[PDB]
Design a protein around this nucleic acid. Structure first.
Ligand code: MG
Ligand code: ZN
Lengths: 653, 1320
DNA sequence: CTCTGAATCTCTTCCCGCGCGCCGTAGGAC
DNA sequence: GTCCTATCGATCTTCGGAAGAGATTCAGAG
């Protein structure tokens, strides 16, 4: 190809074939002109050494070059590896009908939607837009509709909002480690230029919102839409593929709001009255007559689905708080209130959400998750949950704890100053005195944070769980648990040298206060190690997943039951004393290999190829079973695949 | 106390406490004094071009038997100055001219010349020059050479565990690294046999070198090993005991004599026994024959009588051998002492590997191991071996390498030759063997005493050497064969190889970086980067934790925070604020001398290996105003260890609390509080802020802005003191005062400011005045702001009023919520200037034209072109507008159209034309401009001298010799024709009218030369006829998706542009401008951002009291009282300031700049205590909790509990969204395989890359995948059938088989590999 | 006299996206 | 100045990758 003016792009192969053909022209000449052996052995060497270049330049002694020692890319350099066809153009390739933008958070989306800019939708869906303007007969054909789109005329949006009206679009970040990293959403149009993503789903992508771009793809055919809607739509993927654990796990602000809504404060406005239901609980809150975390009694009703699966509705007085009454209004009618009757936090609400999925199923769960999100945002707003430096709490015992520990370290030093302790022992004991100070500072600081709240119970003071701003965030599990708050206001503690060996004199300061220059300079030996690790690791992790999919990709589940009776045995992992995992982690949802007996003898408990779903694993936990034999894909005697029963539960379903 | 006239306009209230004894060095002396060190000639020939010339000249051929020799060099002034050069697009360079003298000798005679011909300065090349901003201009583009940091020349000893063999033991290695030439490695084999190699070639037995130097083995053994002797007298074979050779080891055998036995069999030996051994004088002793039967002999033993061998040096003895050789009369038999701990036998072991006999057989082995396939040959071998280590053409420890070598061998002196010598290698071997004998230490590799900085003035001296090295090879031959009769030096050399060498360097080297001219900080922190990469360095892909990590010698030399996280952490570092390059290139940094017990205010720079010899107190350490330490014991660092030591034990002290950081981090306030992750991301995000439209000042800073904005050279700085004569936002012109004038000059310094222009990153850079007409200015005052500055403080961003709280989730996770009030104010709008160019050529079908007569297009488009064929200035343009109506013969409308998507106002055009080619009225329009701009500024001197000279007529008329019957109405040289007599005054008149004519003739050549600069065309590339460049300015606003960041490494997209009524507002009804999320502060431990907010809030409060005191018409004496009460606030803060001396005028002029918040300094590790922020907030009428109750503008409800409100500083980053939003329906495809193009600069499709395909396969989704990688992508049929089915709305595909896979088949079948598709 | 141990050499692998920026055959002979 | 032909067939490709595995080279001996 020509480039900038009358110059051909140096198009490597044509320099290699040029080498060959020149040499061959000479060799035909010198053969027919009958040169002596030494001359033809010259040209014959130079020809063999040139065809060497053309095939796989650089397996020779040295690669040949035509610039500042750039080796020319030969054929075999075009086939292989990271810039060659197999990886660069075949296995994955660039695609039309795609676009990208910076993502930004859209709180108002229902979980299945994402907003995408009108400019992109109009530049992406063009073929479908022509397929409406001809169908309106409003444009004569492509030749006119093209112009009618270019002019961006007033009709086109009402057409676009009919084209798109339910065409799923696929959003994926990159890298995309796992299936949840491409998902489909129904688009809704936006005026701006960012892609408005749903808040809960950002966690799945590991999409942070700090300027993290994301690509979008339109699926074109009917089949690509039916696959997108049935499989990849975000509503169908509330669980992880890898472990039976939600991926909708609540966003930090949502859980902050729900924690704040459900606390009890022992003094409050409107405390102690009795109400006929959530609705007048809300009227009581919204008019400002009762505080949200005030204690109350309410009439409640709750629903249970019986042994058949049909609802029994029940009603009672409940003793609770205004905000637990309001929150009960969001829960779908089939869960027990005992799941809400407690000050909620990130673990407690994940199990809340999980139990919704356990009891109702998917379709209520996605909507309940949406409502949780909206609720948490709204009460987190009213909560005004700011952060402020007067809210960093230093336990003044910290001053004494250092002033004590410093002298005891100097006792280890004075022995050393008398030769009375060894050079190893002096060090490895001093760092334990600093550990004994550090545990004490941390414990005093967590006690002080809980200690900061005490209030008059109409007469005489009494204590309660601390409304201290940073402590709400830790105690809720929103962000920054013990290891962070310990550094913010307790002490930063011991630090490590480049070779991992521990510093003899720790950072007894904390970030509420200043580090001096040395404490700061040593602090960076931590952090720069942790960043070097990130930037170094991100290669080897990827080369690991490549090697794995590129060995696993041959498997597909391909029979129902291979017909084995063989398998392997599961127990709690008992080691180092106590059990590091229970049986219910391992065995849940495999199929039994062999008939599982009652603990004891001759009474069978589970038939010999039964899926041990949850009601079976709770039953095993009712028994004194320790070892269970189950089928495993390593033992499944299907040729060229695996049988379904040997694989067992599909974790995402 | 005094402040300069640009300080005394916004005296930043300073909270610092430590008195800054050393004021920050000019932040680019790293670069400028490197290049000055290259460009200056220096008779002490090291450093500079002159050193390189003297590295090659004199130059000669033996067969020519004549020479040419360098005498001296001159460097002419650069053909175009920087401003004009940056327009015209060439490189700013200087012509290199060299006095070469060619000397012609004769045969037979003494060498006295037949002739010698000094060529009058042969032209040698064009070396670029550095601009005073420290940047090179290389093709109009402005480029910066980052300093390299790499392993200094020297000798280095090393060892490792597990990386080698892993059986618990460690292997030791020594290297000699020259500056130029071959590396030599010595290393032991595991079995302690010693080996050597050159340049990581094959392993050789190490004595092969000592052989090659023609030591015999007997001599080698006298170089390395201690003697033990046997004397065959008083009884057969007595033995020479040196007592100290037995200690700690077991006396496993009979040694005794004469009285008390020292130590009998089986017992250790100790001091008291050695003293008894000495007191008995054990000079000879009895030992059993097993002892002598252990020995290896020192020296050669032929039988003299037969003349024939019985034993040889390092041959091993036995009783029968000892008998026959002492029986042969060799009554002194001599051997070596080799205790396994202290005297291991490694060289004898090496002589058991050794295949060599003597010198020649080793040279044979050398030449065959090094040059396999060439013949060894006695006359030929040395022409390898000497050029490995002993010849200047190929081995060279520079003066730094020799110094480091000598220091490591513990030599007395460091003025030494650059080549090795026998004893220079032997000393390395001995030191390596001492290490293996356990009596020494290995060096830490990654220590800033072993790695040295190379900067531009050294990289370019090497590349210029590569030049002279290729001229060497040409000129030697041309001289050797030449007749010497007609040749003159300009025949002998030609510039082309030098120019190739240096131009490729400055143009394209891995270190000639294109400058990040993003904002004035990013200019500087780039000019002072330290890079480990590039030529002679390591590589970003090929290093690990050993070098990325920080090291204890970094303190004060390299900033630990400011490194570009990502694939090259710590392979790039930023040279710390105060640090400096030593003479040799090692990084050295200033410390205060602690003299006995007082901190003396004198600074000594310490390199990284001077530092370990002292104990140095941390910068915070207090003093008593005499200067004794206040503390009785104090924290110091010492040997990388740190601990507490006594008062008056300590020996040096840090110079400043800023010493540990770079400017990039030194600008963060309250850095004392931040996690070093978030310090790092802060100090990296500051260098990306784009200059906003109306930039001002950070309210909380560090007082480093007053230095970054000035030293970065981008504010225009007053070269000499004077008074402002005129200002108009394009020119500023200063009547310099006569106390700093040069006597013949007009005395007037213009400053033509640069206006709207593209930065290298497309942000605009318009300088604006800060002065007023008639205002006085002093040398070094800022006259004009740069981009991102105001009043000469750095000012990247805008001091936006932020409150920390959740808001319905719009600021979830990280996002920033923003009020419409900020965008309405044009707070963050920013101007992006693109350059588009239309080239035109003398193509093969014929020459192009620029015209409006374009074929196939009507006035519907052409309405914006003028009649010449270029767009009007001030045309506002959009996609597809024709900017330049180029056309090609045989007529084709190829014309410059504005690319898709972009839009803007055409702010300027430029036109460039070859020689011998016609202009047009847009070239004449530009000539009219530039001529007039030169002529005006010249006239404003000629006018000033004319006025002075006519005064110099008038005054000496009017004062005496008056002729003023009529005077001032007349032409003031027609004043000569008045009738004054031939007394001296008429001769003064005649002479000073001739001085007036010559004053006209003076400018009569100066303006001609200037107009000749403008009249000419330009040095176009071959093929082009002319080029025109057209600039589009876009005023981009701010919108969802744009990125903003704080200084603390907090960052977000802005997520919604909320209308004012929805912002929270306070109990006074002012809404907040931004709502940040709180949870990021504990979760990422960057709580310094809260104290910036509170101190920012107080900063607003003082302006709030001042603005009220200016709306109310308070008298200055009350106003001065409040301002003074603000500056004196706090503890014993460093600064003192007396508004009593500000003359009221300047008190109002000060107030008029505080009236939007008092600016504050919080120097990095020395900031305000909390108790001083509270104190300032109490001086304002503000709530000292810092928090305020807020209400929600959606309802007017109160928020529960107050929330933080205050003035953070926020930067718009250059990652703004419309520069990234992209989408493609269909368009281009690549040629080799039909997959879509990739880009925004091309209308590309996103890569559905490898990992996404596994992601689809992991759903069941097969049809989606089939589509994505065929129909949507590659199948040349199917995509056009798909497109039509979609416009038909059929929703069906025909999938085929991708053409990229057919490419593969042919690319395999283009090997002799028959791959084929198969049927069943 | 070469058979199983071990020893030195080369070959091969090293995240995914993305955006800029520039830079892009020579020398000799007719 | 343009067109055609060839590369260090009279040097010196960078030491600062590890690894990890194989092909290919050598011990102590039956
Ligand atoms: Mg991110
Ligand atoms: Zn099976």
């Amino acid at each position: 190809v020509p480039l900038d003016g009358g110059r051909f792009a140096t198009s490597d192969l044509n320099d290699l074939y040029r080498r060959v053909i020149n040499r061959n022209n000479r060799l035909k000449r010198l053969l027919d002109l009958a040169a002596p052996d030494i001359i033809v052995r010259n040209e014959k060497r130079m020809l063999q050494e040139a065809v060497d270049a053309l095939l796989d330049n650089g397996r020779r002694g040295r690669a040949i070059t035509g610039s500042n020692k750039r080796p020319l890319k030969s054929l075999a350099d075009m086939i292989k590896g990271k810039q060659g066809r197999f990886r660069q153009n075949l296995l994955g390739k660039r695609v039309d009908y795609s676009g990208r933008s910076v993502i930004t958070v859209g709180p108002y989306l229902r979980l299945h939607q994402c907003g995408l800019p009108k400019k992109m939708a109009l530049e992406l869906f063009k073929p479908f837009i022509y397929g409406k303007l001809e169908l309106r007969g409003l444009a004569t054909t492509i030749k006119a509709a093209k112009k009618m789109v270019e002019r961006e005329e007033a009709v086109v949006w009402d057409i676009l909002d009919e084209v798109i009206r339910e065409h799923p679009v696929l959003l994926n970040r990159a890298p995309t480690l796992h299936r949840l990293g491409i998902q489909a959403f129904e688009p809704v149009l936006i005026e701006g230029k960012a892609i408005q993503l749903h808040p809960l789903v950002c966690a799945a992508y590991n999409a942070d919102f700090d300027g993290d771009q994301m690509a979008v793809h339109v699926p074109l055919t009917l089949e690509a839409q039916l696959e997108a809607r049935a499989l990849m739509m975000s509503t169908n993927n509330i669980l992880s593929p890898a472990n039976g654990e939600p991926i909708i796990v609540p966003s930090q602000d949502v859980v902050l709001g729900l924690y704040y809504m459900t606390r009890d404060c022992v003094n409050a406005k409107g405390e102690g009255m009795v109400l006929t239901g959530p609705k007048e609980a809300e009227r009581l809150y919204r008019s400002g007559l009762a505080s949200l975390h005030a204690r109350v009694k309410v009439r409640i009703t709750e629903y249970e689905k019986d042994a058949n699966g049909e609802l029994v509705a029940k009603t009672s007085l409940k003793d609770t708080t205004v905000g637990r009454a309001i929150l009960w209004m969001i829960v779908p009618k089939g869960l027990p209130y005992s799941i809400v009757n407690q000050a909620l936090g990130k673990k407690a609400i994940s199990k809340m959400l999980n139990t919704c999925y356990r009891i109702l199923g998917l379709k209520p769960t996605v909507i309940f998750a949406d409502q949780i999100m909206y609720t948490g945002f709204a009460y987190a707003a009213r909560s005004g949950a700011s952060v402020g430096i007067d809210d960093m709490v230093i336990p003044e015992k910290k001053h004494e704890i250092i002033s004590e520990a410093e002298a005891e370290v100097a006792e280890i030093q004075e022995q050393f100053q008398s030769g009375l302790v060894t050079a190893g022992e002096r060090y490895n004991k001093v760092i334990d005195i600093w550990a004994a100070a550090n545990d004490r500072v941390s414990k005093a600081m967590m006690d002080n944070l809980q200690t900061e709240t005490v209030i008059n119970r109409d007469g005489q003071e009494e204590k309660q769980v601390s409304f201290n701003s940073i402590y709400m965030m830790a105690d809720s599990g929103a962000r920054g648990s013990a290891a962070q708050i310990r550094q913010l206001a307790g002490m930063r503690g011991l630090m490590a040298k480049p070779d991992g060996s521990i510093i003899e004199t720790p950072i007894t300061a904390n970030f509420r206060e200043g580090l001096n220059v040395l404490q700061y300079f040593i602090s960076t030996h931590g952090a720069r190690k942790g960043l070097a690790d990130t930037a170094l690791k991100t290669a080897n992790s990827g080369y690991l997943t490549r090697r794995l999919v590129d060995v696993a990709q041959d498997l597909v589940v391909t029979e129902d039951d291979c017909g084995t009776h063989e398998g392997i045995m599961m127990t709690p992992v008992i080691e180092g004393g106590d059990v590091k995992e229970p049986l219910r982690d391992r065995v849940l949802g495999r199929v039994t290999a062999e008939d599982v007996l009652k603990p004891g003898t001759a009474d069978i408990l589970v038939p010999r190829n039964t899926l041990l779903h949850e009601q079976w694993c709770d039953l095993l936990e009712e028994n004194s079973v320790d070892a269970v034999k189950v089928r495993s894909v390593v033992s499944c005697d299907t040729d060229f695949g695996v049988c379904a029963h040997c694989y067992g539960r599909d974790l995402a379903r | 106390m005094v402040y300069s006239y640009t300080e005394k306009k916004r005296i930043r209230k300073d909270f610092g406490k430590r008195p800054q004894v050393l004021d920050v060095p000019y932040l680019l002396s790293i670069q400028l004094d490197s290049f000055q060190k290259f460009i200056e000639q220096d008779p002490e020939g090291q450093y500079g071009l002159e050193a390189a010339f003297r590295s090659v000249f004199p130059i000669q051929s033996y067969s020519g038997n004549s020479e040419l020799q360098y005498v001296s060099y001159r460097l002419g002034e650069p053909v175009f100055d920087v401003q004009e050069c940056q327009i015209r697009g060439v490189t700013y360079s200087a012509p290199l001219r060299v006095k070469l003298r060619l000397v012609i000798y004769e045969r037979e005679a003494p060498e006295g010349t037949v002739k010698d011909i000094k060529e009058q300065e042969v032209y040698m090349g064009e070396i670029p020059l550095m601009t005073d901003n420290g940047t090179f201009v290389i093709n109009g583009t402005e480029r910066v050479i980052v300093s390299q940091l790499h392993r200094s020349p020297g000798v280095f000893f090393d060892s490792d565990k597990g990386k080698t063999h892993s059986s618990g033991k460690v292997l030791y290695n020594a290297r000699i690294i020259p500056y130029r030439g071959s590396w030599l490695d010595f290393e032991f084999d595991p079995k302690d046999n010693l080996f050597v190699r050159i340049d990581r070639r094959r392993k050789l037995p190490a004595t092969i070198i000592l052989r090659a130097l023609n030591y015999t083995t007997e001599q080698i053994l006298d170089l390395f090993f201690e003697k033990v002797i046997f004397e065959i007298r008083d009884n057969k074979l007595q033995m020479e005991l040196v007592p100290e050779r037995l200690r700690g080891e077991t006396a496993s055998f009979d040694i005794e004599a004469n009285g008390k036995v020292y130590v009998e069999k089986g017992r250790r030996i100790t001091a008291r026994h050695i003293r008894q051994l000495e007191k008995d004088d054990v000079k000879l002793i009895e030992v059993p024959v097993e002892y002598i039967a252990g020995k290896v002999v020192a020296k050669d033993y032929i039988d003299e009588s037969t003349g024939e061998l019985i034993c040889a040096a390092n041959m091993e003895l036995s009783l029968d051998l000892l008998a026959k050789l002492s029986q042969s009369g060799h009554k002194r038999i001599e051997t070596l002492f080799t205790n396994d701990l202290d005297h291991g036998p490694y060289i004898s072991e090496t002589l058991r590997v050794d295949p060599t006999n003597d010198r020649l057989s080793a040279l044979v082995e050398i030449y065959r191991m090094m040059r396999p396939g060439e013949p060894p040959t006695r006359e030929a071998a040395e022409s390898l071996f000497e050029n490995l280590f002993f010849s200047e053409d190929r081995y060279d420890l520079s003066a730094v390498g020799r110094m480091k070598f000598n220091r490591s061998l513990l030599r007395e002196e460091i003025e030494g030759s650059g080549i090795l010598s026998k004893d220079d290698i032997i000393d390395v071997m001995k030191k390596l063997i001492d290490i293996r004998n356990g009596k020494g230490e290995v060096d830490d590799i990654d220590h800033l005493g072993n790695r040295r900085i190379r900067s531009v003035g050294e990289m370019a001296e090497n590349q210029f050497r590569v030049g002279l090295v290729r001229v060497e090879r040409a000129v030697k031959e041309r001289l050797s064969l030449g007749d010497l009769d007609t040749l003159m030096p300009q025949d002998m050399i030609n510039a082309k190889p030098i120019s190739a060498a240096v131009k490729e360097f400055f143009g394209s080297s891995q270190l000639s970086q294109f400058m990040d001219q993003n904002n004035p900080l990013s200019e500087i922190t780039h000019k002072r980067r330290i890079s480990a990469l590039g030529p002679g360095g390591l590589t970003r892909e090929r290093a690990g934790f050993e070098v990325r990590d920080v090291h204890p010698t970094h303190y004060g030399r390299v900033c630990p925070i400011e490194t570009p996280e990502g694939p090259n952490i710590g392979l790039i570092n930023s040279l710390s604020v105060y640090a400096q390059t030593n003479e040799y290139g090692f990084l050295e940094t200033p410390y205060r001398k602690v003299t006995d017990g007082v901190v003396t205010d004198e600074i000594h720079y310490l390199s990284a290996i001077e530092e370990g010899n002292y104990v140095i107190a941390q910068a915070n350490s207090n003093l008593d105003e005499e200067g004794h330490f206040v503390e009785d014991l104090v924290t110091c660092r010492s040997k990388g260890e740190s601990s507490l030591f006594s008062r008056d034990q300590v020996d040096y002290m840090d110079v400043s609390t800023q010493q540990v950081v770079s400017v990039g981090a030194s600008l963060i306030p309250f850095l004392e509080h931040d996690d070093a992750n978030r310090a790092l991301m802060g100090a990296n995000m500051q260098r990306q802020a784009v200059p906003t439209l109306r930039a001002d000042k950070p309210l909380v800073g560090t007082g480093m802005e007053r230095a970054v904005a000035v030293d970065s050279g981008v504010t225009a700085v007053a070269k000499r003191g004077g008074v402002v004569q005129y200002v108009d936002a394009s020119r500023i012109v200063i009547k310099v005062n006569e106390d700093e004038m040069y006597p013949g000059e007009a005395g007037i310094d213009i400053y033509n400011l640069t206006k709207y222009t593209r930065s290298n990153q497309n942000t605009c850079i318009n300088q604006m005045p800060c002065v007023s007409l008639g205002e006085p200015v002093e040398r070094g005052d800022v006259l004009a702001d740069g981009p991102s500055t105001d009043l000469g403080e750095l000012a990247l961003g805008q001091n936006m009023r932020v409150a920390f709280m959740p808001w319905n989730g719009y600021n979830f996770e990280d996002s920033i919520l923003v009020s419409e009030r900020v965008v309405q104010e044009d707070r963050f709008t920013t101007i992006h200037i693109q350059e588009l160019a239309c080239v035109s050529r003398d193509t093969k079908l014929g020459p192009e034209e620029i015209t409006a007569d374009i074929p196939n297009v009507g006035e519907a488009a052409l309405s914006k072109l003028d009649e010449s064929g270029i767009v009007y200035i001030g045309a506002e343009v959009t996609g597809g507008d024709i900017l330049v109506g180029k056309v090609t013969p045989k007529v084709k409308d190829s014309s410059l159209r504005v690319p898709n998507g972009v839009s803007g106002t055409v702010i300027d055009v430029q036109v460039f034309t070859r020689d011998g080619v016609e202009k047009d009225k847009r070239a004449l329009e530009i000539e009219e401009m530039q001529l007039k701009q030169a002529k005006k500024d010249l006239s404003e001197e000629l006018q000033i001298l004319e006025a002075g000279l006519f005064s110099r007529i008038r005054a000496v008329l009017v004062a005496g010799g008056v002729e003023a019957e009529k005077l001032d109405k007349l032409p003031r040289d027609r004043w000569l024709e008045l009738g004054l007599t031939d007394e001296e005054k008429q001769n003064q008149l005649e002479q000073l009218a001739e001085q007036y004519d010559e004053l006209k003739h003076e400018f009569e050549k100066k303006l001609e030369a200037k107009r000749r600069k403008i009249t000419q065309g330009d040095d176009l590339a071959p093929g082009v006829l002319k080029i025109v460049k057209v600039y589009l300015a876009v005023k981009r606003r701010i919108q969802p998706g744009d990125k903003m960041a704080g200084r603390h490494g907090n960052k977000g997209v802005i997520s919604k542009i909320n209308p004012i009524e929805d912002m929270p507002y306070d109990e006074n009804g002012t809404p907040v401008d931004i709502v940040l999320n709180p949870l990021g502060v504990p979760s990422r431990m960057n709580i310094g951002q809260i104290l910036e907010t509170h101190l920012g809030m107080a900063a607003k409060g003082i302006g709030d009291k001042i603005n009220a005191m200016l709306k109310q018409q308070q008298e200055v004496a009350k106003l001065r009282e409040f301002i003074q009460r603000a500056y004196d606030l706090g503890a014993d803060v460093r600064q003192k300031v007396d508004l009593s001396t500000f003359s009221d005028e300047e008190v109002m002029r000060l107030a008029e700049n505080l009236r939007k918040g008092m600016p504050i300094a919080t120097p990095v590790f020395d900031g305000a205590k909390e108790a001083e922020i509270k104190e300032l907030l109490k001086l304002g009428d503000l709530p000292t909790s810092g928090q305020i109750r807020l209400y929600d503008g959606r309802t007017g409800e109160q928020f529960e509990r107050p929330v933080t409100v205050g003035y953070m500083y926020m930067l718009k980053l250059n990652h703004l969204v419309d520069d990234k939003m992209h989408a493609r329906s269909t368009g281009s495809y690549s040629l080799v395989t039909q997959q879509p193009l990739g880009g925004k600069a091309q209308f590309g499709g996103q890569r559905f890359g490898e990992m996404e395909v596994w992601a689809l396969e992991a759903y069941g989704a097969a049809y989606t995948l089939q589509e994505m990688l065929t129909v949507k992508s590659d199948d040349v049929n199917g995509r056009t059938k798909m497109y039509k089915n979609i416009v038909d709305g059929n929703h069906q595909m025909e999938p085929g088989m991708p053409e990229s896979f057919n490419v593969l088949l042919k690319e395999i079948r283009s090997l002799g590999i028959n791959i084929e598709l198969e049927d069943e």
